[PDB]
Design a protein around this ligand. Sequence first.
Ligand SMILES: [Mg+2]
Lengths: 49, 233, 223, 50, 201, 547, 50, 51
Amino acid sequence: VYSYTEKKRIRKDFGKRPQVLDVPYLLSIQLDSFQKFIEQDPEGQYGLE
Amino acid sequence: VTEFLKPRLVDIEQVSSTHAKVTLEPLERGFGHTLGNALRRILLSSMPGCAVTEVEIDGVLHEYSTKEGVQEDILEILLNLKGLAVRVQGKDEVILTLNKSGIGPVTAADITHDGDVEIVKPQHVICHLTDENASISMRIKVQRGRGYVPASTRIHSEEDERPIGRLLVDACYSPVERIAYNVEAARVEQRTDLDKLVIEMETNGTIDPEEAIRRAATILAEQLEAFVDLEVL
Amino acid sequence: GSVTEFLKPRLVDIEQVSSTHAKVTLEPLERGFGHTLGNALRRILLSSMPGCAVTEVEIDGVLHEYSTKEGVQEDILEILLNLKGLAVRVQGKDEVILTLNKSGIGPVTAADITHDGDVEIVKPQHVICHLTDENASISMRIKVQRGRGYVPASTRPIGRLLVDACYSPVERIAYNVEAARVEQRTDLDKLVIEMETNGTIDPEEAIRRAATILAEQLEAFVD
Amino acid sequence: EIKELLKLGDLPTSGQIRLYDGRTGEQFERPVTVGYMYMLKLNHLVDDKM
Amino acid sequence: SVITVGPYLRLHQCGLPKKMALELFKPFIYGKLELRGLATTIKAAKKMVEREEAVVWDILDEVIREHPVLLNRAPTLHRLGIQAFEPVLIEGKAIQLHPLVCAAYNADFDGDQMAVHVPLTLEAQLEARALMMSTNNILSPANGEPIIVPSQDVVLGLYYMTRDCVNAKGEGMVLTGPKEAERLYRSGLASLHARVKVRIT
Amino acid sequence: RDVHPTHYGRVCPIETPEGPNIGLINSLSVYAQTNEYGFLETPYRKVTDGVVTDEIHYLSAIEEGNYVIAQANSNLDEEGHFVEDLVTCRSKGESSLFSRDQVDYMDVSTQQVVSVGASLIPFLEHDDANRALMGANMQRQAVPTLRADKPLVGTGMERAVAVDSGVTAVAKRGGVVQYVDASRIVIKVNEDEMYPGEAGIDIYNLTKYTRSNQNTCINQMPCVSLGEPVERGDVLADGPSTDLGELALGQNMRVAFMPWNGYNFEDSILVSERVVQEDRFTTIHIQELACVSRDTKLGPEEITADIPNVGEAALSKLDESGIVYIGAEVTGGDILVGKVTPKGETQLTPEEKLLRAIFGEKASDVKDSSLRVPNGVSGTVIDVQVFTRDGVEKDKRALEIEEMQLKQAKKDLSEELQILEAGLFSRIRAVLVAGGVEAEKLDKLPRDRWLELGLTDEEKQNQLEQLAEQYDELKHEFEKKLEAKRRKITQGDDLAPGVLKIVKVYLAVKRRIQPGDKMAGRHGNKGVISKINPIEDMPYDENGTPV
Amino acid sequence: IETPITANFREGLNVLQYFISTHGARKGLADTALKTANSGYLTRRLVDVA
Amino acid sequence: MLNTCYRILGLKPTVIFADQIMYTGFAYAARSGASVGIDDMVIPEKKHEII
Ligand SMILES: [Mg+2]
């Protein structure tokens, strides 16, 4: 099934290997590091505390 | 035996509104390609077209702005307006006014009907109005030229373009898009080795096919006549 | 300006190398028109342009396609190669035939052919072959033929022998498009026609007939 | 799969068609490979370099 | 600037844009516009070439005519990395440059940039013509091998021309010169590879 | 500098900038996560007894060094078992060919070695590694063109890279599009995805024609139309170099491989003129020019349009307040901002004394330091931002711009309050069609009492009052945030010490393509284009189409 | 490496054969990176000795 | 050949020769149409047997 953005122009795919994992959200490194940094960490583990 | 058979054109299969297919029947040997590539280069090079040049939208300073109540940016409206094929019928330059209010698309049929300006396809969308009390007004300046004339070489002496609210579009006064000649055998009775050049042009709608071939052969023969009287040095 | 005025040639300046090798550089052409003029003229002159040359030659002794005549150091193949470049100019007679009966000592040139009033062998010093210093004979019924282009012998019974035919008087045409320049208009062509013929006609008249053919093909479409 | 795609359209399976010349109209010998490469444009623009 | 090919050049020539060549040859154009009477001072001769009149483009074609310029690539290794060329004016922004000399410069047209230079003084315009001109440097200084060898496209074209197949058109016909060979091939009557008895001289 | 047998799945081996730092500026692989401690771990799906169970375990480097990991190109027989009886794999750095029961893990996907940049080259595995490296390094310098097209040969990671950057506008709660302008999108939220407090109308304001760091045109145009249902995560507005939420860095062109008359000799590239007629590569560049007005010890540099020793030909384009008009087509050398600067002790040489006595001209105590356009750039002035230190008097231009910005912000808050009121009374009407339904009586009394209408003893009666106190909260919020925005606009600025007003003028150049410009494919097939060939000279196939 | 890479560039490479034949490229590119830095200094010395 | 011309004839009819070589080699690779397609890499049939 397809979303309504994919019923516009569905790109023909030659992938033969059945995929298992999605591509993860590509900006996890920078966002997760700065979320560890500025955070009220209740124990003294991460960032400012 | 040695004189020649001269080509005369035969039926013009107007197979679509834009398409065409002309045929030049009793051609001699080897002049098929000689006239075919000549006419392809001439037709594709230099024909009189009637593209647009200046659009003066009502409340618009520059093309890099948007307009409120319309869906395309102004630059996309200009890129839609460049491809507006229009055949001016009486004069050289002309000014077309477009006024449209309320939701819906704006095809080129909403351009104010002049007598001597015939929009060839009224389906050609221009901009998409997207609101109820939203309107547009522009003076499309259409003039007749030849060959690709960009806006950079257009501004020579500024031409008194003191209104800043007038946008300048690049011009493409050239009705043709593809020519593809094709030689074959000409089945006249008392002759074997003749050709029959089948030119299959694809205009945008402004130019007539017979007038395209007529201007092409005319401009070739008029470039030619520095030779038929040689005038040695 | 309008849409019907065009940059026309103004300075054709035909400088020639002394008999038959012009170089007609002409300019300014509109951008791209140099190539269409040059290619149209090149294919018209090279392919189909009327004139006369030699098609078949029978020898008195040799009936074979490639064999030995006695007294000549040149083979019959070499004699036909020399006969292909025989620049014949014919008047209103369409198909005339010639004879070359000469027994002698040295070379046989084009001066010792028979003479008709309508036949102009424009290079009398055109040697054909060389006889030995003997009573060796050579006599051929060489036939010229008025034609329109180049007809090789592969396209075409006594046994006569068949020459290649090159009726068109050109031998080498080569246009060359280079950039001209008007004081404001940037990109213009400058067609440099280079043309050498076989001397039966000057390169002025060759270019004039190439113009006349191309213009008279367009008589049905121009105004 | 590319050959079957080229046979789904009317194209020749080699991907190689007979280009003709521009200025003469004599056909090119040895027919050439035409297709649709996705070309880019980099910002080593000559007006920023000159 | 950036460089391009322009393979119509003769090998002592190079393409110079009308904007670099107007800039470099500035004091020569002042010295000529004073000479023609078109500007009696330098404060007028400056504002003439400032707005780039129609007559400052005819002066430039004079002051450029036999004045060599000095093209040079950035990793200058050997003495063939600086050569001289009589420039030819281009409506462009790039430096057109003969294909046979990119072997010497080790220049590719993938965005490699070359710098230009003006020999001002009268000795230097002769130094660049007698010693650094491109038609003078045809052998490498490192060894007697030639340096202006045909590189990659011309040689493939020359390979394709100088071949024979076993059965092409016109195989076996005899030919009365290297010019009937051109007339046969341009009329499409024989292929470019056909074993043919010609007469050469 | 070297690649390692541990880089596989963590660091891309073909994305590093060549030059002095090769392999010091490595790029992270696609699926490559990061540990608790920080060593790069990568997912692997565990082979059980004989089948590839999808328990995707992230394995770090030292833990990778023990097991026997299969390859992504190991055929599976639709149950999980490997097709062969011995399947290639890699144990400890070195590969092998182990028995199919011996293995311990299988790779996740074929992409997990390469980065996100090099996951966009179609037929990567056919290229050499050097040209793949140059393709990956050159694909991130592509200028976003006038109208970006598509990859006709894509990789599927187009959409994930386009969505997962911040360049487009993706919908947050799916719903029906209510109104799309050229710069804003108003989504009306679907019912179940709407939180019951607010009356959800998401307003996405796009970014229009602002500059990048590299002076390109970062610009967002809407892709959806009015009345179109979109879902969550759906892309509404293409960013720069995007098309329908796919990455479109360049434009795909009909190409041919043949040597054409030497004009494409080493890496040079012919381009037909019909390319530049179609404006396929006409990128827009937006530069920013600035003009500070310091406080020199001779006195303040003023800003006015009375500049000495310049004629009317340049002063036509400025207004009376010394700044240029928005929309003015400026070019090389024209005055943008006329800045007079004071000076003293002139002591003129007698040639200029004689000159000013010949023409009757006065000496000028103010020198001219006007911000003029640099030489060569000819753009269109699209924006003037006037800053002022507090206490300095704004001129007519800055007062005009502050009036315009205040009217825009007041209209913005009125638009949010009014269209939020439209959605508010739409949900109030949706409350008012159940349990005390007044099909015309609700339409009889006006919207003063729609959120105070009598219903049954349900949650909807104190949901009319909930949307009522929502609307009265908005009623005070509009005025308070209006005064906030008004005092935030009309306040002074925090400039440097000594500078009075800073005038930024944003040119916008629409650069064409020309001989000299560098183009490239996706595979290291770069080359500066070399001739804008016309349409006739470019070769044509037997149907008419010039390549 | 014992087990060689046995696919041409027409047939394409798998993941492992492409990973194996990438040390050979990152070794060659770093070679030309450091090679120019040495060869500049060599001819710098050679000019001043002569 | 462009060295024996330099040795036999001299400098000037070698500098005029290298331009004509380039002008001919470009013009006859233009008409050559010499492309490269994917069928031009003939993978050998005994490759599978050898492997
Ligand atoms: Mg390079």
